[PDB]
Design a protein around this ligand. Structure first.
Ligand SMILES: *[C@@H]1O[C@H](CO[C@@H]2O[C@@H](C)[C@@H](O)[C@@H](O)[C@@H]2O)[C@@H](O[C@@H]2O[C@H](CO)[C@@H](O)[C@H](O)[C@H]2NC(C)=O)[C@H](O)[C@H]1NC(C)=O
Lengths: 208, 217
């Protein structure tokens, strides 16, 4: 059994978006298909379900005007459309269903609603017995970025902080690591930054 | 059917016992098979929710025995015996009698002894300065508990409103936090002043710790 959800979604306010949930490994019409919203300060919230056998839908009252659930028997795929989007709709969304000895959840689809447009980060060095160094990963949209150090050869003492949303509507974060001061002249330190939405890749040497 | 979880958050040391409550506004006990349609999920930071228990008390495959679910009808309990550092997560209950409901979750934090932060200050880079904006960064490393304050000073003038902070999740091994504070100045303002300082307080510090630099030195 597998529930495969569609990729990350980006939307301007007031528009609508439609995400999918492809079911495999069982008879699609035999189980109701539920949708769940995960928003940072709102826990988990049930949106509603569709009975794929008959297309009957039932909604959480809080989503009766926001979500529209549909299903395609021939392709074993359920859909959720979210309309009149605002930043309050930014969240991770899941499809799920129950079984006799478990529950099956999709991997989730992330939705960001913003007036911002996709933009790669600028990467700036944070220059250094213990020394701290890092990289400032500034002014990107949407989330996420990934940061590694020395192509993964350096992991201990690394802290890559959660992004903050700036007043510009762009994100910024820093990644830091602590190393022996005595190592600065014998070991190179490089932050590897990747922002896949913009295909941005930056590998910056950080030196005192 | 409404679900109420308590407490909303708690901090418990490794090795100790944890009990958390989930109460439903209606019975989720199905008379035909005498099963409670209630489950427990564990959601670790950055991960999707993972099923721990179903039928109120049946462990999902792979779940260790230190997780125990109990209760019937409307009153349910999740117990974690001898909590381990890996058990840091938000725990949600879930009723599925027909439609679904989720509780508000109980955030389990790992309690440990107090640790004061180590502090580091970073000037803005020459490259960024070519762009009209200056970001000054201060790092607070490996501290507990989570609460701390960074006070920025520019030529001994207290700054307000032009900083943003971000805190890591608890370290998987030592349960400490780290924090970054970023001070945002125009390049014009940055080049008009000399002494840049971040003054740090934390409940483990007897007196504030200040790190500073002089622009261009
Ligand atoms: C933490 O709890 C353990 C386990 O006891 C519980 O007992 C049941 C009533 C139920 O609540 C289960 O979820 C638990 O298993 C305590 O360990 C027991 O300690 C007593 C006295 O030393 C001993 O006779 C038992 O055999 C122990 N049981 C196990 C499983 O080891 C433990 O003392 C508790 N610790 C604290 C600090 O409260």
């Amino acid at each position: 059994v597998q529930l495969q959800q569609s990729g990350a979604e980006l939307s301007k306010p007031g528009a609508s978006v439609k995400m999918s949930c492809k079911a495999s490994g069982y008879t699609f019409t035999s189980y109701w298909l539920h949708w769940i919203k995960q928003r940072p300060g709102q826990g988990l919230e049930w949106i509603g379900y569709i009975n794929p056998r008959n297309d009957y839908t039932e909604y959480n009252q809080n989503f009766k005007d926001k979500a529209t659930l549909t299903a395609d028997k021939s392709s074993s795929t359920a859909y959720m459309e979210l309309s009149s989007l605002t930043s309050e709709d930014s969240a991770v969304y899941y499809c799920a269903r129950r079984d006799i000895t478990t529950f099956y959840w999709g991997q989730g689809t992330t939705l960001t609603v913003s007036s911002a447009s996709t933009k790669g980060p600028s990467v700036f060095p944070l220059a250094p017995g213990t020394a701290a160094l890092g990289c400032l990963v500034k002014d990107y949209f949407p989330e996420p970025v990934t940061v590694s150090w020395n192509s993964g050869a350096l992991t201990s003492g690394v802290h890559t902080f959660p992004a903050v949303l700036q007043s510009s509507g762009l994100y910024s974060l820093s990644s830091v690591v602590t190393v022996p001061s005595s190592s600065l002249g014998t070991q190179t330190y490089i932050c590897n930054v990747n922002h896949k939405p913009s295909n941005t890749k930056v590998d910056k040497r950080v030196e005192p | 059917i409404q679900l109420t979880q308590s407490p909303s958050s708690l901090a418990v040391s490794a090795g100790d016992n944890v009990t958390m409550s989930c109460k439903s506004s209606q019975s989720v006990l199905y008379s035909a098979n005498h099963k409670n349609y209630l489950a427990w999920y564990q959601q670790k930071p950055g991960q999707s929710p993972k099923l721990l228990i179903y039928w109120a008390s049946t462990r999902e495959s792979g779940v260790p025995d230190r997780f125990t679910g109990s209760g019937s009808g409307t009153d349910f309990t999740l117990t974690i015996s001898r909590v381990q550092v890996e058990d840091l997560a938000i725990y949600y209950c879930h009723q599925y009698l027909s439609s679904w409901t989720f509780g508000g979750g109980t955030k389990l934090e790992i309690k440990r002894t107090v640790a004061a932060p180590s502090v580091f200050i970073f000037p803005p880079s020459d490259e960024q300065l070519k762009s009209g904006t200056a970001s000054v960064v201060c790092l607070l490393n490996n501290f507990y508990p989570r609460e701390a304050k960074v006070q920025w000073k520019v030529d001994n003038a207290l700054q307000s409103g032009n900083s943003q902070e971000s805190v890591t999740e608890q370290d998987s091994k030592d349960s400490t936090y780290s924090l970054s504070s970023t001070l945002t100045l125009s390049k014009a303002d940055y080049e008009k002043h000399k002494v840049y300082a971040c003054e740090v307080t934390h409940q483990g510090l007897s007196s504030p710790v200040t790190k500073s630099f002089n622009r261009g030195e």
